[PDB]
């Protein structure tokens, strides 16, 4: 997270850390007790998922859980076309027990509103080029479809939306993939991609447009 600040501890209790061999590679978002949503580009054959964290070290975080997961369901049309449909559902080996620090978040049924200021959180790169110790939070502004298309054509697709690009250089960056973008208190997007480098004025990042996938998500959960 570029130009954010420490999240209030446990204020984003749906945040999931995706780690393997003890190193973070993406985040995800708890959307039901047994289900973590993440970007499809974060797919691996198995996962160790950290829930209830603030720092990434579970042994330093009361109430946290490191849950195993082997099964994930990529959206079947992920990357067809390229970068589109960037979501997957990770099935935890067992349901979590939701608590004060581990909680699912409702997914937006309505699509992003241009100009909305939405919160993004993660343990990805900071403005100073380092990785944070604790979860970072920043707000970014949803950009119109018209501008998103101009920047990202011909790969722009309605499974995507743009946010950020402000003079403030607030953005998500490497390590933030798969984590949440929250508008109106609902999960609106997942961190997906951008033009390198992160934080360019006038070049918003791109997020998975979850309002397009609520049916697919629940179909997967119920099947």
């Amino acid at each position: 997270i570029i130009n954010g600040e420490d999240c209030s501890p446990h204020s984003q209790p749906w945040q999931a850390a995706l780690v393997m061999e003890n190193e973070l590679f993406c985040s995800g978002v708890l959307v039901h007790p047994q289900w973590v949503l993440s970007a499809a580009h974060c797919f691996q054959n198995s996962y160790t998922i950290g829930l209830g964290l603030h720092s990434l070290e579970a042994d330093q975080e009361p109430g946290s859980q490191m849950v195993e997961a082997s099964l994930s369901v990529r959206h079947p049309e992920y990357n067809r076309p390229l970068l589109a449909n960037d979501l997957m559902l990770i099935k935890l080996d067992e349901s979590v027990s939701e608590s004060d620090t581990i909680r699912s978040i409702s997914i937006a049924s309505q699509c992003p509103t241009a100009g909305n200021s939405c919160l993004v959180s993660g343990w990805g790169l900071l403005a100073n080029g380092r990785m944070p110790t604790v979860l970072q939070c920043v707000n970014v502004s949803v950009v119109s479809e018209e501008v998103c298309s101009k920047l990202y054509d011909p790969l722009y697709h309605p499974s995507m939306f743009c946010a950020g690009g402000g003079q403030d250089q607030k953005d998500s960056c490497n390590g933030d993939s798969g984590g949440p973008l929250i508008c109106n208190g609902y999960l609106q997007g997942l961190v997906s991609f951008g033009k390198a480098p992160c934080g360019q004025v006038g070049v918003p990042g791109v997020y998975t447009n979850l309002c397009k996938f609520t049916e697919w998500i629940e179909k997967t959960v119920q099947a």
Binding site: S172, F193, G194, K195, A196
Partner: peptide, 13 residues
């Protein structure tokens, strides 16, 4: 230069 925000980034321009 369209890169995902994973570690490492997956870069597709």
């Amino acid at each position: 230069g369209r890169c995902t925000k994973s570690i490492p980034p997956i870069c597709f321009d």
